[PDB]
Ligand binder design. Structure first.
Ligand SMILES: [K+]
Ligand SMILES: [K+]
Ligand SMILES: [K+]
Ligand SMILES: [Mg+2]
Ligand SMILES: [Mg+2]
Ligand SMILES: [Mg+2]
Ligand SMILES: [Mg+2]
Ligand SMILES: [Mg+2]
Ligand SMILES: [Mg+2]
Ligand SMILES: [Mg+2]
Ligand SMILES: [Mg+2]
Ligand SMILES: [Mg+2]
Ligand SMILES: [Mg+2]
Ligand SMILES: [Mg+2]
Ligand SMILES: [Mg+2]
Ligand SMILES: [Mg+2]
Ligand SMILES: [Mg+2]
Ligand SMILES: [Mg+2]
Length: 57
RNA sequence: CUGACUGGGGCCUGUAGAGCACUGAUAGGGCUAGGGGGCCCACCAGCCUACCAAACCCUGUCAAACUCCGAAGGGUCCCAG
């Protein structure tokens, strides 16, 4: 499982990166979600790597 | 539950780059159809050129409307989140 925390604001970033955060359920700064490590989920995690911090739990 | 976005799979494309196979452009040399003069000689032709220049050969380049090539990506469909 992956633990993903939103640490940088998506203001000013392209709409596809905003949509990737919505697909992951990250809506607030510093919000923390535990998601399953599957390629479909992981693909969106990589897309917004510069905005989030990822840990394995 | 079909959405943005994402994962896998197939198909579509001629840009970036690159290249000279086509079309044009183009540097140096070699070889020479044909040019300027020329030893001339019109009875008849070769030859002389550190003056041009067709093709050809070597070396060396350029291109939005060149392409023997050709990505990253993008588009679309199917299945999955
Ligand atoms: K669904
Ligand atoms: K050419
Ligand atoms: K595809
Ligand atoms: Mg920011
Ligand atoms: Mg905004
Ligand atoms: Mg920004
Ligand atoms: Mg900003
Ligand atoms: Mg916030
Ligand atoms: Mg180019
Ligand atoms: Mg090429
Ligand atoms: Mg040119
Ligand atoms: Mg030449
Ligand atoms: Mg070129
Ligand atoms: Mg160019
Ligand atoms: Mg070129
Ligand atoms: Mg053309
Ligand atoms: Mg081209
Ligand atoms: Mg579905």
């Amino acid at each position: 499982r992956l633990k993903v925390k939103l640490v940088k604001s998506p203001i000013g970033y392209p709409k596809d990166q905003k949509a990737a955060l919505k697909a992951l359920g990250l809506r607030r700064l510093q919000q923390e979600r535990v998601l399953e490590d599957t390629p479909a989920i992981r693909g969106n995690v990589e897309k917004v790597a510069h905005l989030v911090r990822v840990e394995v739990v």
